[PDB]
Design a protein around this ligand. Structure first.
Ligand SMILES: CCN(C=O)/C=C/[C@@H](C)[C@@H](OC)[C@@H](C)[C@@H](CC[C@H](C)[C@H](C[C@H](OC(=O)CCCN)C(C)C)OC)OC(=O)[C@H]1CCCO1
Ligand SMILES: Nc1ncnc2c1ncn2[C@@H]1O[C@H](COP(=O)(O)OP(=O)(O)OP(=O)(O)O)[C@@H](O)[C@H]1O
Ligand SMILES: C/C1=C/C(=O)O[C@@H]2C[C@@H](CC[C@H](C)/C=C\CC1)O[C@@](O)([C@@H]1CSC(=O)N1)C2
Ligand SMILES: [Ca+2]
Length: 358
């Protein structure tokens, strides 16, 4: 009777059991194959990253390689959670604006390949909102491969008001790699990309005011931090710390014509019924690894406040567990009494087929 919750991200799989407070398994969403003259999945491929070429079956939150996605799900059930999938209801997650045909293929594979007894697919951002104890709010979900603004009213996303930025954590890593390369370091390989990811996570932050932070870094060493590389060389960064994530608010830093995440948040709220905007402004929930930066919630507060009506009460909620918010929300929902009627059963699939999932 124990359901499974699998939150499949562009970069990381978060998997576990409904009712747990954290995912049992968190591993890279990769399939690795030998570079030269048979497959490795997840942590397997990370170990052998040196000798493998890596594929990510999910791009910008959307499954694009179904052969390798099947390998991921098989690995999730059999090697990480160590379950027989035919014995467990399985809650899967999907990105906002996931194409309807993709949801159908997810459904077909769960029932026909893994013979699950029941399953469901929920939108990631909605689950994050639930995990914060809300059914109304606007979620900023930013992961490794995509960022979305998702306004939600009384339990349900408002699809017409969703906004999408094809920029998230991996882009920020790649930008810092570029900055550090121009300063004379060599960050090229897959393992080297991972070093820069770690630098980013450990030392980058979002400035409250970019211009004043730049002025400070130009006139003082007070913002410098150092990082010891694996070969023992020490790197010092100052304004690189906040120029990297500034890209979220200024996508032009990496050549992108898109609006920044503050403008997409505002534009999302402005797409919603005027009568519910007060509730959205007061319930901005941040979700995903790329919202983890120190300063990001305060900066969002400042930027939304500048855009919004004078008298508007604005609140940014940044849960400490938000690297895993989506998963936690799925764990709560899949263990909820009210949800047990909502599972798609094998018996319903066999009669209606994949279309059943809408
Ligand atoms: C998923 C498909 N969907 C859209 O895509 C819509 C699915 C509808 C059919 C409902 O699914 C039955 C949704 C809307 C569910 C979500 C409820 C979430 C999980 C959470 C439940 C509380 O848990 C916390 O608050 C955790 C706090 C952690 N600190 C309860 C346990 C105390 O409430 C936010 O709503 C409800 O059941 C009622 C109940 C209270 C308001 O609505
Ligand atoms: N403390 C941190 N500061 C900044 N970034 C972080 C931190 N921790 C994790 N990240 C970043 O978050 C990303 C992974 O987050 P998450 O698991 O939410 O994404 P995902 O679900 O795999 O991707 P997506 O939601 O885009 O499909 C990575 O880019 C990682 O570098
Ligand atoms: C620790 C960890 C973080 C992460 O988010 O990992 C995911 C998954 C990973 C896959 C290859 C990597 C070598 C394997 C495991 C790292 C998993 O790619 C990422 O690191 C990529 C590359 S750099 C970056 O910022 N995103 C993100
Ligand atoms: Ca995600």
């Amino acid at each position: 009777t124990t359901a499974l919750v699998c939150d499949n991200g562009s970069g990381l799989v978060k998997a576990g059991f409904a009712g747990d407070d954290a995912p049992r398994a968190v591993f890279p969403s990769i399939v690795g194959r030998p570079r030269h003259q048979d497959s490795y999945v997840g942590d397997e491929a990370q170990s052998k990253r040196g000798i493998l070429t890596l594929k990510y079956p999910i791009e910008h939150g959307i499954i694009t390689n179904w052969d390798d996605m099947e390998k991921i799900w098989h690995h999730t059930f059999y090697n990480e959670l160590r379950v027989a999938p035919e014995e467990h209801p399985t809650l899967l997650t999907e990105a906002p604006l996931n194409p309807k045909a993709n949801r159908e293929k997810m459904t077909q594979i769960m029932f026909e390949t893994f013979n699950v007894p029941a399953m469901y697919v929920a939108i990631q951002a909605v689950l994050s909102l639930y995990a914060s104890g809300r059914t109304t709010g606007i979620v900023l979900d930013s992961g490794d491969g995509v960022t979305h603004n998702v306004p939600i009213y009384e339990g349900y996303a408002l699809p017409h008001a969703i906004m999408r930025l094809d920029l998230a954590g991996r882009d920020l890593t790649d930008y810092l790699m570029k900055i550090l390369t121009e300063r004379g370091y060599s960050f090229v390989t897959t393992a080297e990309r991972e070093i820069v990811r770690d630098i980013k996570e450990k030392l980058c932050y979002v400035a409250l005011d970019f211009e004043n932070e730049m002025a400070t870094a130009a006139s003082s060493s007070s913002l410098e931090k150092s990082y010891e590389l694996p070969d023992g060389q020490v790197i010092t960064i100052g304004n690189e710390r906040f120029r990297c994530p500034e890209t979220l608010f200024q996508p032009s830093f990496i050549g992108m014509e898109s609006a920044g995440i503050h403008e997409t948040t505002y534009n999302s709220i402005m797409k919603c019924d005027i009568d519910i905007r007060k509730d959205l402004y007061a319930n901005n929930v941040m979700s995903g690894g790329t919202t983890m930066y120190p300063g990001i919630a305060d900066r969002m507060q400042k930027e939304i406040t500048a855009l919004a009506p004078s008298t508007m009460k604005i609140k940014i909620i940044a849960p400490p567990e938000r690297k895993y918010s989506v998963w936690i929300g799925g764990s709560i929902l899949a263990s909820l009494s009210t949800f047990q009627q909502m599972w798609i059963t094998k018996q319903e699939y066999d009669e209606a087929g994949p279309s059943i999932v809408h």
